[PDB]
Ligand binder design. Structure first.
Ligand code: CHL
Ligand code: DGD
Ligand code: CLA
Ligand code: CLA
Ligand code: CLA
Ligand code: LMG
Ligand code: SQD
Ligand code: LHG
Ligand code: LHG
Ligand code: LUT
Ligand code: BCR
Ligand code: CL
Ligand code: CL
Ligand code: FE2
Lengths: 176, 54, 30, 210, 307, 333, 218, 34
């Protein structure tokens, strides 16, 4: 049913073109990035305490030392990527700050969609495409596809409207 | 025809080579790089059994 | 008209990327 | 190559070089105009090569006179109408009566103008009747439709040209006839939304009497 | 041992019964290879040809003569390599280039076998010579070519023309051209015009599809193969329901080519990840810091800062 | 001394700032080629026939597209899987019409990112770390290669690859849902669990470490000046943080080892992304998603409807409208 | 040193008489011991045979490379008249003289007796200078001079130059044996040698040599 | 276009030969070592 809700937004609201949803996916997917980065960095620039190669058995939980070389990981990511962190206060605070910023900036757009202030069609490309026929951008294909969603799924999605479309009314595509 | 083009799609030629002029450049770069490496062999580690492994 | 605004914004983002990479404060020791 | 020189090749040898987009080159058969007997013949493989696509640029830069402009092809090797046939009489003194009914008679190609403007157009010799004597074999053809009536416009809504043949080389034995070819046809319009453009096509051709 | 394994296949082709060719006329048939083509300038073409469309890599193999001749080459070559390595030792340009340990030997083999898996995937999805269409089913391009040929043979015998039938947009509904000038089918098999199957090649002439042969020379077994391939096109599902995702539960069908291709692609990609594991770990263990940075001797605090 | 020895010493030095290494000689020029083609083609590319049906498609900024709708158009379907460089074309007004720069940029970008993964191995070996950063970086490489290389090989055309643009990405995704039903596929749900769990674990660890920072500064200045760089003192009380988490949920779902916690952070989203990387490759070869059409049947034999029988209607609505001017024969798109 | 000494790599492996001949034990490059006829029992005879062999070697290298190179170039992309070293000499008589590299704007050589005279004069000069020592180097070693015509200077170390001696001799013996192969193929098949290689690689079992085994029948 | 094609093959084969003869040139000893 969540899938029906997702296609409901995709075919009625065009939730795709919402910049608040762009913020949301940036926050979610960057948090999923930075989790993997930090996990594959910290236990990889690890120190030398045990004897065998099983490095999990060489950690005192009551420890006053470190367990990963901050200088070495800084030099690593500085030479590969360019900018690299130097403050592991700020690192974990940035891991805190990314996905909540993404989810709040998605919630604001869900509010704006609840009021039916959707990120539907623009002005410029539409008034240009009504005049000049051969324009055909992916934008003007997504709109002409979302119309095909909304005219097919509605007659069984919402029966309280009490509408039965004839087959001539439906967007056919000339025998695809 | 109307225009001029190599017509190299779908042929099935080794290394995509059409002219032998195009074919000589492979060896002309490979041999000179090999020769520079083989000169640079002087300042490396050559040995009987001094092997780099466990 | 707005294409120049688009291009100016993209080039300015790339410029801030450039200055962030090369003209940072040096991460210094103890 | 010639006709047997082409058909000696295999499909693995034709595939990938552009030999398929050619008329077979005819041998020395010039000025054999008295070596032409009569009969209600047909053609075996009536192929026509184009070699230059020029467009009448209606924009003015000199005065009230516009010429034809050499341009570039756009799609790929997508020309040389093939396997055309019909009914092809040779008369008394050289009066050819050439009737086209079947075969791949159409090819849709796009072509720029210097100025960065694309123009699509058909290349159609559908249903041509050329009745002439070996210098200006004239007659008209059809430009049926650039696109079908069942075409969807991008928001889900919704003639005759000139053609002149010629004959240069004649095989007296097998009836292989070469020659030069010219035509002028209109461009595509999107149903009156854009006014058409005149397009001249020059080329060669080839045919085998039977 | 691998050379004798290849010569077993060579002997089975050359002397023992025979191998099922899919290019014999009148349908596929088991035949005995008499002249395996062992031309070096032909067989070492396929190893060098471009891995893209039209050209193709060694998946573009077509002849059983070429297959068995290449196996003759491998049977000679591997025996020569065995006699080489039993009596020779590695030379110093290879005694310094390699990491000589236990896990490293696994690391090389994992990357090799991952490449083997990718090549097997692209073999089993595209080829119809070594994986015949009568046994494994039709292939990807073969389904679309079979559909277009079936509807052309359908609509030819009713009155409409096969040549002048202009489609929706000007291009040919049934017959059109290639990018390189040949005459092929239309629709969406213009991405699949590189297809060469034995039910279609006798209808194919010098310029491609001979219009005279499509008028006059259609075979009934070709009609049957074309009628069944569009029915059993490879359109699976994980719950084994044939057709598109927008199809009712009609036919319990998934092609075996899909299972072979997907399974070997996943099982090659994991061996690639295993190679990226072990080739790092082996050189790190040979270096001496597979267990972590030592706290006393640290390689960073001797170097310069970068500023 | 020698030229080659001095050149190798320079190229495997660790004192030049952006490291190069030996994979860098393919990582650097090839990605600079891809970037320098992409910036030009995002701005001034002429319209491209994506369909092979003589309909060019505008994708660049100069022809009435903004930053969202701007995209590099993929190659035409008549071009197929054929390798189509500049030198095989007729002109540069003919190469750009038939899907030019996509074929160049994709084949450059893939060779760039594989050598970038090799470089991430190489600098770790040059410094003396343990070498497993490239194993974690193998996941988005697989996710890029599945949509740029594997899926166009499976569909037989470079048309169905992902268009290089924001508004083109979604037109890839929706038509992929139409033809393949990606949501009803168990690999994709594992990847959704991967990305959501990755966000959860990142926010959770960044909460539980920042909540245990030892007071070393005042309350007027920044709370980030308490960490002097390159020290040996553990700035977060991991004992107190683990005790707080154990009081919060469970004592047997402990993960008291910091190294076990970091292995779990390194292995949750990477294995999450690997299963979608396999899932795209399986759907490339037409091994479809799930299908629950007409499952719930009453005692007579009539057909009831479920949420699967609504998603079937939505996918029919997408399918009878995607590629509106090409499809004539009733299947195989 | 493996290459020369009492334990060099002899000319039959374990089967090389279990001993050298008694008049040569190392001390010179290229010594394997193959003098079974015993033609060099006297040391001055042996020195003359080295002084002859090394010059035949250094000519045989150039004679090999000059008989490979035009069959590569003309068959690849150029024009020569005829590139095969049969008819490489007959290019003066052909149409307008010998166009070097197939270009009638450089040398364009005629007057074959004048070319013969220039060859006789210049080769008399250099083959007298090689014996006595003249300009661009005084005569100090008849085989290994090592002076301003050797500009790169690799013969400074004794041991590396001692190895390069053996490399030059091994390449020399190979070049001589190959040129003898060129001459016998030139007598038998009458075709170019790289043409013979391209004919052999097409069908190695039937175009071997034994197809040309009944040509010289009485 | 052939003038371009010689140049592209030249650059590609230069970088690939630099790659291969780099990794043959004593790689696993340019580490911090033991
Ligand atoms: C232990 C095995 C072993 C054997 C059997 C040989 C064999 C030989 N090695 Mg030797 N080698 C061996 C070990 C090694 N060799 C070498 C390195 C070398 C070198 C550098 C050389 C040799 C040479 C020789 C030859 C010395 C005698 C000779 O001149 O042939 C004379 C006898 C024949 C030629 C008979 C050949 C029989 C054949 C069937 C004749 C064909 C008949 C035709 C039909 C006749 C044509 C008819 C007419 C009318 C036209 C001989 C062929 C010499 C050589 O081959 O020069 C040409 C030489 O220069 N070897 C090394 C590295 C250290 C070895 C280590 O194991
Ligand atoms: C709920 C639990 C939560 C899930 C937890 C994780 C589950 C993992 C456990 C393993 C998988 C589940 C086992 C039981 C399901 C099953 O298997 O059930 C499936 C079958 C049993 O079902 C049978 O499946 C058959 C499938 O039809 C096949 O046979 C037909 C005619 O014979 C047709 O030919 C048709 O084309 C073809 O699809 C028929 O439908 C039968 O009617 C039906 O009874 O068992 C089999 O096959 C055995 C399985 C084969 C081995 C699996 C390897 C196959 C290679 C693919 C892997 C590559 C990597 C992934 C890419 C994908
Ligand atoms: C499959 C089994 C196998 C394995 C594991 C090995 C392994 C090895 N061989 Mg080997 N060998 C084999 C089969 C095998 N060989 C066979 C069948 C033969 C007979 C032809 C030989 C003949 C042989 C010789 C003569 C020598 C080796 C050597 C070596 C060692 C170093 C190899 C090296 O650095 O070059 C790796 C290869 C290269 C660097 C080649 C360049 C790679 C380019 C990029 C590709 C071009 C290669 C080729 C033409 C491929 C075409 C392109 C395309 C199809 C991909 C290594 C232990 C050397 C050694 O010291 O051992 C004694 C050596 O001198 N081998
Ligand atoms: C664990 C799961 C698993 C399973 C179930 C399979 C199953 C299969 N794999 Mg496979 N594979 C796997 C994992 C798996 N693989 C992995 C992890 C990899 C690495 C990525 C591969 C790599 C791989 C390759 C590279 C290939 C297969 C192939 C195959 C198929 C046939 C097996 C075959 O040809 O034997 C292989 C045979 C041998 C190893 C030995 C045979 C040698 C003998 C001597 C030959 C017999 C001689 C003669 C013909 C018989 C006697 C005649 C005599 C009278 C003369 C089969 C469906 C093949 C296939 O059909 O491709 C689709 C194929 O090409 N797989
Ligand atoms: C110009 C020819 C020539 C000459 C003068 C020499 C001279 C010498 N060689 Mg030598 N050699 C040659 C060519 C020659 N080489 C070639 C082509 C090869 C390769 C097969 C070798 C391989 C070789 C080895 C492996 C060894 C020598 C050795 C020697 C030295 C002592 C043997 C001796 O007395 O030779 C006297 C030789 C002659 C007087 C030449 C006679 C020429 C006439 C025409 C008869 C030849 C007919 C011929 C055998 C027919 C078949 C030809 C075909 C095999 C090419 C001496 C300095 C030994 C040594 O210590 O090296 C320094 C040694 O172990 N040679
Ligand atoms: C170690 C490498 C192991 C690789 C394992 C995976 C192999 C995948 C298949 C690779 C194909 C190899 C054969 C070469 C094909 C070829 O060159 O055809 C030629 C093609 C293109 O060539 C084109 O071919 C056409 C023929 O129809 C036309 O002639 C065109 O004019 C011509 O340009 O070249 C390539 O695209 C390959 C270049 C990629 C180079 C990548 C180097 C990466 C670093 C290398 C590391 C050392 C190796
Ligand atoms: C017609 C085509 C036009 C193409 C134009 C190409 C434009 C792009 C070129 C890149 C310019 C920016 C980098 C230059 C500065 C630099 O070298 O760093 C300065 C340092 C200083 O090094 C030091 O450099 C010294 C030399 S120097 O005097 O200082 O210059 C040296 O002596 C010393 O050993 C060393 O420590 O250099 C290095 O660390 C390594 C040099 C190579 C690294 C630069 C290449 C990285 C480019 C990234 C590519 C990916 C980007 C993808 C697109 C977004
Ligand atoms: C070798 C070639 C490959 C690398 C080339 C690419 C390098 C990318 C460099 C990123 C520059 C961003 C600088 C952040 C500003 C900066 O300099 O950060 C600097 C910061 C330094 O941390 P410190 O420890 O010094 O901070 C100390 C405290 O006092 C304050 O934090 O580093 C980071 O935190 C890394 C975060 C990188 C996050 C990058 C995400 C950016 C996404 C891209 C945004 C632009 C969109 C592009 C579209 C046009
Ligand atoms: C269609 C068929 C396709 C076939 C493709 C063939 C691919 C060939 C791949 C070769 C890989 C070689 C691996 C490195 C080999 C290597 O390790 O080098 C090193 C090796 C010598 O090593 P050493 O340093 O130990 O030498 C001994 C002394 O130096 C010890 O101090 O040299 C060779 O053996 C070269 C072998 C031939 C190599 C080819 C010949 C090179 C010159 C030819 C170029 C002509 C120049 C013309 C100028 C215009
Ligand atoms: C040691 C011994 C020992 C025992 O005891 C005995 C015995 C056995 C007798 C012995 C052996 C011996 C031998 C084997 C020998 C051989 C030799 C030779 C063959 C040489 C060659 C040698 C050879 C040589 C020099 C060669 C040379 C060549 C030349 C210059 C060439 C020239 C030329 C050229 C460029 C080209 C042109 O177009 C022309 C010409 C003019 C033609
Ligand atoms: C039967 C068959 C055939 C043939 C086959 C064959 C004959 C194969 C072979 C193949 C081959 C013959 C392959 C090759 C391989 C090798 C390789 C692929 C190499 C690679 C590289 C490497 C391994 C290296 C690496 C590195 C560097 C870069 C350098 C140094 C060292 C190192 C390690 C660092 C044919 C065609 C008929 C088709 C059908 C099937
Ligand atoms: Cl769309
Ligand atoms: Cl279709
Ligand atoms: Fe962590």
């Amino acid at each position: 049913a969540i899938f029906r809700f997702i296609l409901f937004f995709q075919g009625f609201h065009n939730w795709t073109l919402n910049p608040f949803h762009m913020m949301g996916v940036a926050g979610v997917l960057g948090a999923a990035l930075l989790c993997a980065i930090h996990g594959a960095t910290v236990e990889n620039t690890l120190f030398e305490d045990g004897d065998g190669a099983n490095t999990f058995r060489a950690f005192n939980p009551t420890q006053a030392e470190e367990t990963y070389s901050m200088v070495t990981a800084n030099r690593f990511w500085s030479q590969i990527f360019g900018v690299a962190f130097s403050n592991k206060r700020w690192l974990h605070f940035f891991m805190l700050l990314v996905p909540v910023t993404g989810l709040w900036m998605s919630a604001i757009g869900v509010v704006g969609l609840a009021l039916n202030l959707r990120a539907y069609d623009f002005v410029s490309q539409e008034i240009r495409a009504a005049e000049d026929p051969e324009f055909e951008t992916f934008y003007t294909k997504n709109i002409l596809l979302n119309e095909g969603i909304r005219a097919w799924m509605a007659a069984q999605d919402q029966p309280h409207e009490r509408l039965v479309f004839p087959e001539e009314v439906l967007p056919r595509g000339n025998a695809l | 025809l109307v225009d001029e083009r190599m017509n190299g799609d779908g042929t099935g030629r080794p290394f995509g080579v059409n002219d032998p002029v195009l074919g000589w450049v492979l060896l002309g770069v490979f041999g000179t790089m090999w020769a520079i490496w083989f000169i640079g062999q002087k300042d490396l580690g050559d040995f009987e059994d001094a092997d780099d492994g466990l | 008209m707005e294409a120049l605004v688009y291009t100016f914004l993209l080039v300015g983002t790339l410029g801030i990327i450039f200055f962030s990479i090369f003209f940072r404060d040096p991460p210094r020791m103890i | 190559l010639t006709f047997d020189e082409i058909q000696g090749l295999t499909y693995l040898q034709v595939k990938g070089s552009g030999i398929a987009n050619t008329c077979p080159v005819l041998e020395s058969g010039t000025t054999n105009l008295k070596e032409l007997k009569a009969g209600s013949y047909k053609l075996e493989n009536f192929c026509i090569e184009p070699t230059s696509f020029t467009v009448k640029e209606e924009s003015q830069f000199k005065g009230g006179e516009t010429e034809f402009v050499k341009t570039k092809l756009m799609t790929r090797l997508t020309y040389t109408l093939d396997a055309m046939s019909g009914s092809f009489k040779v008369g008394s003194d050289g009066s050819a009566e050439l009737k086209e009914d079947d075969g791949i008679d159409y090819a849709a190609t796009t072509v720029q103008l210097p100025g960065g403007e694309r123009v699509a157009f058909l290349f159609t010799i559908k249903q041509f009747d050329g009745k002439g004597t070996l210098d200006n074999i004239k007659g008209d053809f059809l430009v049926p439709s650039y696109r079908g009536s069942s075409f969807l416009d991008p928001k889900g809504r919704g003639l005759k040209g000139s053609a002149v043949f010629s004959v240069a080389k004649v095989d007296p034995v097998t009836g292989e006839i070469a020659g030069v070819f010219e035509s002028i046809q209109p461009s595509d319009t999107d149903l009156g939304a854009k006014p058409p453009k005149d397009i001249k096509v020059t080329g060669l051709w080839y045919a085998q009497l039977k | 041992m691998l050379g004798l394994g290849a010569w077993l296949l060579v002997w089975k082709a050359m002397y023992f019964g025979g191998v099922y060719d899919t290019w014999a006329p009148g349908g596929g048939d088991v035949r005995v290879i008499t002249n395996p083509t062992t031309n070096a300038a032909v067989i070492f073409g396929y190893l060098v040809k471009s891995p893209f469309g039209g050209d193709g890599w060694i998946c573009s193999v077509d002849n059983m003569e070429d297959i068995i001749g290449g196996h003759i080459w491998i049977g000679t070559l591997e025996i020569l390599g065995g006699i080489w390595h039993i009596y020779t030792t590695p030379w110093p340009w290879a005694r310094r280039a390699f990491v000589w340990s236990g896990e490293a030997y696994l690391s090389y083999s994992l990357g090799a076998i991952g490449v083997m898996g990718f090549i097997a995937c692209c073999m089993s999805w595209f080829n119809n010579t070594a994986y015949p269409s009568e046994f494994y089913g039709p292939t990807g391009p073969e389904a679309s070519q079979s559909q277009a040929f079936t509807f052309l043979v359908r609509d030819q015998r009713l009155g409409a023309n096969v040549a002048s039938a202009q489609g929706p947009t000007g291009l040919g509904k049934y017959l059109m051209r290639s990018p390189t000038g040949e005459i092929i089918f239309g629709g969406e098999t213009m991405r699949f015009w590189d297809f060469r199957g034995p039910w279609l090649e006798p209808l194919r002439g010098p310029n491609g599809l001979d219009l005279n042969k499509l008028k006059n020379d259609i075979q009934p077994w070709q009609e049957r193969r074309a009628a069944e391939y569009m029915t059993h096109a490879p359109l699976g599902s994980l719950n084994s329901v044939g057709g598109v995702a927008t199809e009712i539960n009609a036919v319990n069908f998934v092609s075996p080519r899909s299972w072979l291709a997907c399974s070997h692609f996943c099982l090659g990609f994991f061996f690639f990840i295993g190679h990226l594991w072990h080739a790092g770990r082996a050189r790190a263990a040979a270096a001496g810091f597979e267990k972590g940075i030592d706290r006393f001797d640290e390689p960073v605090l001797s170097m310069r800062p970068l500023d | 001394s020698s030229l080659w020895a001095r050149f190798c010493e320079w190229i495997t030095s660790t004192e030049n700032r952006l490291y190069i290494g030996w994979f860098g000689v393919i990582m650097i020029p090839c990605l600079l080629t891809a970037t320098s083609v992409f910036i030009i083609a995002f701005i001034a590319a002429p319209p491209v026939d994506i369909d092979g049906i003589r309909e060019p498609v505008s994708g660049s900024l100069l022809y009435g597209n903004n930053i969202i709708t701007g995209a590099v158009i993929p190659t035409s379907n008549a071009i197929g899987l054929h390798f189509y460089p500049i030198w095989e074309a007729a002109s540069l007004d003919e190469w750009l019409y038939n899907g030019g720069p996509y074929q160049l940029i994709v084949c450059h970008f893939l060779l760039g990112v594989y050598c970038y993964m090799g470089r991430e191995w190489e600098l770790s070996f040059r410094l003396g770390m343990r070498p497993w950063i490239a194993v974690a970086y193998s996941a988005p490489v697989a996710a890029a290669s599945a949509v740029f290389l594997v899926y166009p090989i499976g569909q037989g055309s470079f048309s169905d690859g992902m268009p290089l643009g924001i508004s083109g990405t979604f037109n890839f995704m929706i038509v992929f849902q139409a033809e393949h039903n990606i949501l009803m596929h168990p690999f994709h749900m594992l990847g959704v669990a991967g990305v959501f769990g990755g966000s959860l674990f990142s926010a959770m660890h960044g909460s539980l470490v920042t909540s245990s920072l030892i007071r070393e500064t005042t309350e007027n200045e920044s709370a980030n000046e308490g960490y002097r760089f390159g020290q040996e003192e553990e700035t977060y009380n991991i004992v107190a943080a683990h005790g707080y988490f154990g009081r919060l949920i469970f004592q047997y779902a402990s993960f008291n080892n910091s190294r076990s916690l970091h292995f779990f952070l390194a292995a949750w989203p990477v294995i999450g992304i690997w299963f979608t990387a396999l899932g795209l490759s399986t759907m490339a070869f037409n091994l479809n998603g799930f299908n629950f059409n007409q499952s719930v049947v009453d005692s007579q034999g009539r057909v009831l409807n479920t949420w699967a029988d609504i998603i079937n209607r939505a996918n029919l609505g997408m399918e009878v409208m995607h590629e509106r001017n090409a499809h004539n024969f009733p299947l195989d798109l | 040193i493996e290459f020369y000494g009492p334990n060099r790599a002899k000319w039959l492996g374990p089967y090389s008489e279990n001993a050298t001949p008694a008049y040569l034990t190392g001390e010179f490059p290229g010594d394997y011991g193959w003098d079974t006829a015993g033609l060099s029992a006297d040391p001055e005879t042996f020195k003359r045979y080295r002084e002859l062999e090394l010059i035949h070697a250094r000519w045989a290298m150039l004679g090999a490379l000059g008989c490979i190179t035009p069959e590569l170039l003309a068959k690849s992309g150029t024009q020569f008249g005829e590139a095969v070293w049969f008819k490489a000499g007959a290019q003066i008589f052909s149409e307008g003289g010998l166009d070097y590299l197939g270009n009638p704007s450089l040398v364009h050589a005629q007057n074959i007796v004048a070319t013969l005279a220039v060859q006789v004069i210049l080769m008399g000069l250099v083959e007298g200078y090689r014996v006595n020592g003249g300009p661009a180097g005084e005569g100090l070693d008849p085989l290994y001079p090592g002076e301003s015509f050797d500009p790169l200077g690799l013969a400074d170390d004794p041991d590396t130059f001692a190895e390069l001696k053996v490399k030059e001799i091994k390449n020399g013996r190979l070049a001589m044996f190959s040129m003898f192969g060129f001459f016998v193929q030139a007598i038998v098949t009458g075709k170019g040698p790289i043409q013979n290689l391209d004919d052999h690689l097409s069908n190695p079992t039937v175009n071997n040599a034994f197809a040309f085994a009944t040509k010289f029948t009485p | 276009m052939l003038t371009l094609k010689i140049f592209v093959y030249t650059v590609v084969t230069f970088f690939v030969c630099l790659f291969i003869f780099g990794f043959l040139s004593n790689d696993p000893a340019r580490n911090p070592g033991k």
